[PDB]
Known about the structure:
The structure is cut from a larger assembly and holds ten protein chains of seven kinds.
Chain A: H1 14-20, H2 24-30, H3 33-43, E1 46-48, H4 52-58, E2 70-73
Chain B: H1 9-24, H2 39-49, E1 54-59, E2 65-69
Antiparallel strand pairs in B: 1-2
Helix pairs in contact in B: 1-2
Chain H: E1 11-12, H1 14-23, H2 26-38, E2 39-45, E3 51-52, E4 66-72, H3 73-84, E5 88-95
Antiparallel strand pairs in H: 2-3, 2-4
The complex binds 3'-deoxyadenosine-5'-triphosphate, magnesium ion (MG) and zinc ion.
Chain I binds one RNA strand through loops.
PDB class: transcription/dna/rna
Keywords: Elongation complex, transcription/DNA/RNA, TRANSCRIPTION-DNA-RNA complex
Entry title: Human RNA Polymerase III de novo transcribing complex 12 (TC12)
Amino acid sequence: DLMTYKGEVLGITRFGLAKMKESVLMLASFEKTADHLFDAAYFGQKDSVCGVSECIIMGIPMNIGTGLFKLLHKADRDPNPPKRPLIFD
Amino acid sequence: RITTPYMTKYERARVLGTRALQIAMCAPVMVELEGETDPLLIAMKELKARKIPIIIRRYLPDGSYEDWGVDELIIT
Amino acid sequence: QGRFRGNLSGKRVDFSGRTVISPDPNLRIDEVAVPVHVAKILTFPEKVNKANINFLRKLVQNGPEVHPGANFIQQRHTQMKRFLKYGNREKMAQELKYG
Amino acid sequence: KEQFRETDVAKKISHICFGMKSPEEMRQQAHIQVVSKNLYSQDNQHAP
Amino acid sequence: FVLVEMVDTVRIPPWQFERKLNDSIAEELNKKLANKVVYNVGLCICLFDITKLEDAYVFPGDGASHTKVHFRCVVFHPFLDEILIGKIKGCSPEGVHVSLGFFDDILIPPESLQQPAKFDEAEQVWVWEYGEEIRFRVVDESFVDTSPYTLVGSISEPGLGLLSWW
Amino acid sequence: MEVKDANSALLSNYEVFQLLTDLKEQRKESGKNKHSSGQQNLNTITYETLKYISKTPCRHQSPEIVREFLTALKSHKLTKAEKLQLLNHRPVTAVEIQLMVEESEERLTEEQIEALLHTVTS
Amino acid sequence: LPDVVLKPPPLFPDTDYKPVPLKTGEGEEYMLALKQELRETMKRMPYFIETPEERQDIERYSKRYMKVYKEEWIPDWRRLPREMMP
Amino acid sequence: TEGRSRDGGLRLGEMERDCLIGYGASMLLLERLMISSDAFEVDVCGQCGLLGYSGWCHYCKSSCHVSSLRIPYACKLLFQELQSMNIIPRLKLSKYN
Amino acid sequence: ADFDGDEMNLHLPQTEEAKAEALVLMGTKANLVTPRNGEPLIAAIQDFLT
Amino acid sequence: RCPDCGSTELVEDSHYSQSQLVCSDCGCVVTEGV
RNA sequence: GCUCGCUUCG
Ligand SMILES: Nc1ncnc2c1ncn2[C@@H]1O[C@H](COP(=O)(O)OP(=O)(O)OP(=O)(O)O)C[C@H]1O
Ligand SMILES: [Mg+2]
Ligand SMILES: [Zn+2]
């Protein structure tokens, strides 16, 4: 399914990986570092941190695994607290 | 309410880690530990007693979210 | 040996050891035996709380020589580390603040 | 009396925008101009 | 005095979880915004109220409780024509040094508009006779950090008459 | 740390006085050692602003009195700044309204001043 | 071999050739005066749209006295497409 | 460092990272490859997206938009080398919320 | 492994969250079966089968 | 001198391949890492 | 301390 989700059978080689993926950092890290980096600098393509490889490189928790969701604290609170009335207005 | 009611192992690991990190930073204990010097053991005791004050915020890929309590979810 | 493959995707870390293995059937499948020598070097930072205070006190009192113990103390207010091999360890144990 | 300035913010990088720099931007970013081809001084201290 | 709406990301450590969230949020906001001047806003006094308080996240980093809080706080910022009553906490030859009562010693009235008997001879002489009134004129703020105060304002004292004190 | 509006709503000194008294009583009922030691500027600014307001005639005020004063001044087509200054200062003498209060020309009418004094003194 | 330089070249190197003096005459001065007049008269023209001031502090009785008044030109909506009508 | 005679530590190779990814342990991978190996705190200017020093941006000659950021030191080295290669990475920072 | 000179590495996490994630997700009791085909890998071996 | 106790007993003592100039009286780590 | 080569180890 990963090889056949864009309508064309794309291989696991660098060409198919470039045609499938969009992240500049992963394309540079896998193969053809300088070429991909210079092409990205020419195109000015902004690369997000959605992928796992860029999350590992930039030192942030990856979106896959335990980092897909967020946790909330069950603290004793009261949303929308009563507001002090304005006397002059 | 549409997701799986069972609490996954990743949620378990993350909740236990957050609870252990909090307890290690002088957080109040709600299970009255009996000689447990390891914060992870205290977190596991709180999870088994279902007294962890943490609400998981499951995010859908499109952007929607939903809140599930630890006591509300099913543990194995 | 580039930056991406040698320094970004895979990089060397500390607090790790490497040793030859030998069989031991008397241990559980989820347990592993660690030598005393490596255990005295690989340290774990435990935060002083209301639960393990009396345990960390005894650990500091033992010192870096006895196996159950510690090697360094980082205060909550100041981040200046203190070596347990020098100075009065009893005074440091008696002055273990939370955090 | 005292101005309110934030000490530290939990900033998270969103995305990296690659690009190029003009020579004027290269001059503005740099601090000093390197014109000497030698490395160290003639004295025995060999200071840069 | 005027209300200002602010949105702040407050971090509460885990050892304050037994306390009520709103009380600790108010305490932290007051500790963060006491005796400080916000640029283009003025000197904030304290927190007035908390309007909106959304969910409290816990980050995989520090592990504390981060809450985005919308609140209204009181600040001291005249409207370029307000009348104030201060006390003379000093005087310079180029201008008197009046200070609002225990509030802020930043009011520097220029002595260039009174009747033509204006001068300060360094002996704390206010003005030659023919609770001190003040008319704020313009606000001005400045930054502090510029290498690897901020509120003075101009004060007017016109020919108010002042039958009580010259 | 951005502000939404620095001029959202002007308030008189009575609201500030009430807020300061409430904060002072809540502090003295919930005094914390480490919280106070972390920042002592809060206590200083609150106490000194409360003392400054106490030096002013801002005492003996209530929300009902402020509402009555506002309803009385609404018939005089005065601006919000003028009534705010009159409430904060509480002028007992006419000369305070004659000269000190701005926009004196064409507004005093030499007859409304007595009504203004009667309203502010009540 | 070329010598080594201890200090960087000057930020503005000197030149032995100076710019030719400007042309003189009644025409150049008249054109200069007319350009200055155009600069002075085109900012007050209604075509010169200024930045709309916002965030008024208070409303006052003097607002009517300080209210800026200026005639506004009416664009010909017959030639201009419908998308620019207010 | 690398060798035992050089008193070096063990290396979490690419396949170890792959195994940690397959397990889904994001926090453990972050602690191993960022916190415990090459953690550093840099100063990034939110206006131009360049790296500053001591809370100051020499490019913009200002310090209001400079903010601290945690980062692997190898990543900062890569960014500096790319800036040397005229491939300027401009970082657009934002709040963690 | 075959205990004929194998050198193995031993890492110590420096975070409570990392420790908990390692114990939960990478627990020996929780990974008794491979994800390839579900067959159990941690089982009896020579001198235990005999 | 030691920054804590002010003593001048600063000895270079390496602790398990860690170059460290430390005070000999109170054990205050003056400098570490090479 | 950087580099390279050989050598072993599983
Ligand atoms: N180049 C290598 N890459 C990966 N693993 C290796 C390599 N060389 C040795 N090993 C390790 O050693 C093990 C190889 O042993 P194996 O080939 O199964 O037995 P053997 O060496 O043929 O012994 P016998 O000759 O059968 O007695 C498996 C692997 O983890
Ligand atoms: Mg082997
Ligand atoms: Zn900049």
